[PDB]
Ligand binder design. Sequence first.
Ligand code: HEC
Ligand code: HEC
Ligand code: HEC
Ligand code: HEC
Ligand code: HEC
Lengths: 218, 27, 73
Amino acid sequence: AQIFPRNANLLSRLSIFALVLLVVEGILILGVYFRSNYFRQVNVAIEQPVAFSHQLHVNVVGIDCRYCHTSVDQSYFANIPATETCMTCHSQIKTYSPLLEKVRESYATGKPIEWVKVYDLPNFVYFNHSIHVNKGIGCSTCHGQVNNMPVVWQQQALYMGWCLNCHRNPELYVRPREEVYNMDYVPPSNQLEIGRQLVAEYGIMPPDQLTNCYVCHR
Amino acid sequence: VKPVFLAVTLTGMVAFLLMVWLFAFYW
Amino acid sequence: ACTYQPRQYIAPFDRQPEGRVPGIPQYFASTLTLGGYGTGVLVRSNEGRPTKVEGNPRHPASLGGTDLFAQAE
Ligand code: HEC
Ligand code: HEC
Ligand code: HEC
Ligand code: HEC
Ligand code: HEC
């Protein structure tokens, strides 16, 4: 009552309460940003220079994935199709069309097509497509339903815990060697029983080794 | 007094659900 | 400042090499000379670029071994 109004006793306690809420809200905003779909570029349809539609070439035309990414079951790298594979069809199909101008400008000149990488890794990760495909893991569980994407987007962010989830518990995501095709295939109702049997048959190593640092980082 | 003890209690659990959601079932 | 990582473009071929699997290094048999005398070396090409030099077990004077100059070439 000397130097303070009557309401200050309520305000001071309310201010402390408001301060705590603001602090909690701050940490919340921070975590939401580092896990958002804009920061990780998840569900964002990255625009390509030639506007290639996987939905037209897989679900309509009916091209196999290995016709284009021919190095997926043999090396760590899934091959990105050269202009020769595109000209094999577009030398007669839709020739003299504006949408294929960039593809026709290449192959005549040695310049490549500068596609944008959708699935990106920080170069200290070292992923291997061959070992995953040969051990009964399909593209549906990783890249999603790519066969129906007019523009390819990142289905989910490539966190470390996302790899650790399958490596520690592979019984939930393993499939019986129908990975290249059967994008329509989905986990059966009895996935745990089939998964444990597949892990034993394919010799998928226990989580003790698969969680080691040098399996990924080098 | 007892009302504000309940208020600072609901505030706490509210925050926990909030926080737990973000750091667990969010991705 | 945002988006965690930049765009990172990717530039493939226009005509694929016949015998190369992308992402698989290959080995070629060549020879490295020191003072005019040759030494058979097995050199590794990652994507058409030399990166590592090792010994050629089939070549005398390099039975799976190299000198420091063959490594530093
Ligand atoms: C190499 C990776 C490529 C690229 C860059 C494109 N294709 Fe094809 N394509 C094929 C067929 C039967 C069609 C539809 C024909 C029609 O609509 O009349 C297409 C279509 C396209 C387009 C759109 C053209 C348009 O809308 O007018 C584009 C931009 C495109 N393609 C690019 C057939 C094949 C094929 C199997 C014979 C293969 C392999 C490719 N295409 C490869 C590529
Ligand atoms: C069978 C359904 C598949 C699957 C699972 C994938 N592809 Fe393709 N691919 C082709 C071209 C020209 C590109 C680059 C243009 C673009 O990305 O829009 C790709 C790219 C991909 C990606 C993303 C690459 C990345 O950097 O993230 C993925 C995940 C992918 N492919 C898987 C060409 C073809 C094609 C015609 C030549 C055919 C058919 C397919 N791809 C089929 C598949
Ligand atoms: C063994 C205990 C380790 C250690 C010490 C680290 N890892 Fe991982 N890692 C994997 C993937 C796919 C990523 C990318 C994550 C992302 O893009 O968000 C990482 C990343 C990391 C980091 C963060 C690096 C940084 O922020 O600069 C760190 C510090 C790290 N790793 C250390 C993949 C795996 C994996 C599955 C194959 C496993 C097992 C490990 N990493 C193990 C370890
Ligand atoms: C479930 C769909 C998985 C996801 C997600 C990731 N991986 Fe994996 N990985 C999976 C299986 C079924 C196996 C086979 C295990 C075996 O013992 O054969 C693996 C194995 C690997 C390996 C090779 C193992 C080795 O000993 O060298 C590597 C290098 C690897 N995995 C890397 C990796 C990374 C970096 C991932 C995040 C991008 C990732 N895997 C995810 C299944 C699954
Ligand atoms: C989760 C296991 C996994 C499976 C199985 C898998 N992918 Fe990949 N794919 C990834 C990851 C992780 C990357 C990112 C690689 C990088 O950033 O270097 C990637 C990248 C790619 C790329 C870009 C080129 C490259 O080599 O990185 C293509 C194309 C691709 N995937 C297609 C395929 C095809 C075709 C298959 C065959 C079914 C397949 N994926 C199976 C996880 C997988």
